[PDB]
């Protein structure tokens, strides 16, 4: 969070992202890492984030950059 | 209390003048343990008052009190299931204490700009026999007179 450190990301997620982008097409990518920032090279993909029970699919766009993955998968049910 | 005798605490006299009455007045006026503020207020008020009447501060103060000291009051009794107002005589220390309390209570309720100004206005009205303090004294005496049958 301090700028002299840069952002944070998980290594396994980063490697999978690189493979998918360089190889082109991809089915949804499953992830438990809700603490990772979204980098510009992710746009266009489908990341399925854990929320406790299921995996919620998110189709990344360009306005999401700089968010954490967890903000697009809420954790509680209320009606 | 039930089985006690309580002695009298000693009180220092005022520094500027030398009266214990004025020290008790400062004490009754103070709040939260700030004696300096109370002394400032009282001294300023007495200064602005001495002019308006051309006499010493002590004389102005005494004449102001003599119109608010009460004489008889009413206590409440209930032994037969009904409340009765019984008139009683007031004693000197209580006379002075009640007068001071009423003067300060009336002062705090006015609507002038400064507390010293309110205090001075109230003291002047008292010396002229007008204001809430004198009204309170009159009301107490009226209640006491209306219940003389239960003495």
């Amino acid at each position: 969070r301090s700028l002299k450190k840069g952002p944070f990301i998980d290594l396994h997620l980063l490697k999978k992202v690189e493979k998918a982008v360089e190889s082109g097409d991809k089915k949804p990518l499953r992830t438990w890492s809700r603490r990772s920032t979204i980098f510009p090279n992710m746009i266009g993909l489908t990341i399925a984030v854990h929320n406790g029970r299921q995996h919620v699919p998110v189709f990344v766009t360009d306005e999401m950059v700089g968010h954490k993955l967890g903000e697009f998968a809420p954790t509680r049910t209320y009606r | 209390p039930r089985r006690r005798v309580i002695g009298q605490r000693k009180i220092l006299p005022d520094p500027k003048f030398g009266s214990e009455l004025l020290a008790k007045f400062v004490n009754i006026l103070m709040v939260d343990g700030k004696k300096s503020t109370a002394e400032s207020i009282v001294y300023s008020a007495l200064e602005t008052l001495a002019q308006r009447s051309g006499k010493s501060e002590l004389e102005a103060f005494e004449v102001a009190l003599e119109n608010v000291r009460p004489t008889v009051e009413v206590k409440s009794r209930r032994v037969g299931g009904s409340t009765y107002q019984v008139p009683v005589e007031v004693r000197p220390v209580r006379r002075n204490a009640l007068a001071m309390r009423w003067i300060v209570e009336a002062a705090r309720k006015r609507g002038d700009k400064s507390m010293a100004l309110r205090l001075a206005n109230e003291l002047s009205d008292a010396a002229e026999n007008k204001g809430t303090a004198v009204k309170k004294r009159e009301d107490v005496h009226r209640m006491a007179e209306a219940n003389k049958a239960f003495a």
Binding site: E63, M64, H67, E71, F72, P74 | -
Partner: protein
């Protein structure tokens, strides 16, 4: 005196009076009056047209009033459309910075409803 589209009082000191603008606080007020070169305790009723124009020039260096309001509204609308946690909080009317909701929260909820 008209400054940014509004009328600012005349009997107040300048540093207080300039605060009537939506976008200006005490820090910016002090900074602007320092740049203009006027004392902080001068009534606005004792100023000249040239001095008022200098103050207009100073105030013109910030974002105030309608532009600021549009900026804030767009900022909120972006989240509301995106649909993230904060956006859902915004479009339900509950606290957004993680405060308790078992009790209190009456500034975001309004008075009680039996």
């Amino acid at each position: 005196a008209r400054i940014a589209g509004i009328n600012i009082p005349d009997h107040k000191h300048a540093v207080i009076a300039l605060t009537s603008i939506y976008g200006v606080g005490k820090t910016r007020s002090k900074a602007i009056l320092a740049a203009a070169g006027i004392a902080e305790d001068v009534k606005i009723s004792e100023l000249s047209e040239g001095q008022i124009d200098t103050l207009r020039d100073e105030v013109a260096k910030f974002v105030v009033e309608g532009d600021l309001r549009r900026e804030i509204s767009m900022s909120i609308k972006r989240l509301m459309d995106l649909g993230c946690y904060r956006g859902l909080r915004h479009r339900r009317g509950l606290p957004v910075r993680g405060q308790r909701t078992k009790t209190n929260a009456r500034t975001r909820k309004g008075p009680r409803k039996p």
